[PDB]
Design a protein around this ligand. Structure first.
Ligand SMILES: [Cu+2]
Ligand code: NA
Length: 105
């Protein structure tokens, strides 16, 4: 796959790793809707608002299967470690008007 998943569970915002590239979620938006990272970087999404959100990549984007990330409650987080250059678009499953992308380069 073009990304690996360190934790299938969401985890606490305080548990975010040094060196992770953070995208905050608040006001029903991904706060960095276009993020540029390098191969091998870990991107960590952190939900900063009461409304639960996830990240969802359709099939073929990160690998053969869709990746429907777990729902993050407020102050929960979720990571992906990207292993291949490319453009990876995602959305929020319950809120598909929320869109972003990670460009790995
Ligand atoms: Cu959402
Ligand atoms: Na992004």
């Amino acid at each position: 796959d073009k990304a690996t998943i360190p934790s299938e569970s969401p985890f606490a915002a305080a548990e975010v790793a040094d060196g992770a590239i953070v995208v905050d979620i608040a006001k029903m938006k991904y706060e960095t809707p276009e993020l540029h990272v390098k191969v091998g970087d870990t991107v960590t999404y952190i939900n900063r608002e009461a409304m639960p959100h996830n990240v969802h990549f359709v099939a073929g984007v990160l690998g053969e299967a869709a990746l429907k990330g777990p729902m993050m409650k407020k102050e929960q987080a979720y990571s992906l470690t990207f292993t291949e250059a490319g453009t990876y678009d995602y959305h929020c499953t319950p809120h598909p008007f929320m869109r972003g992308k990670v460009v790995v380069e």
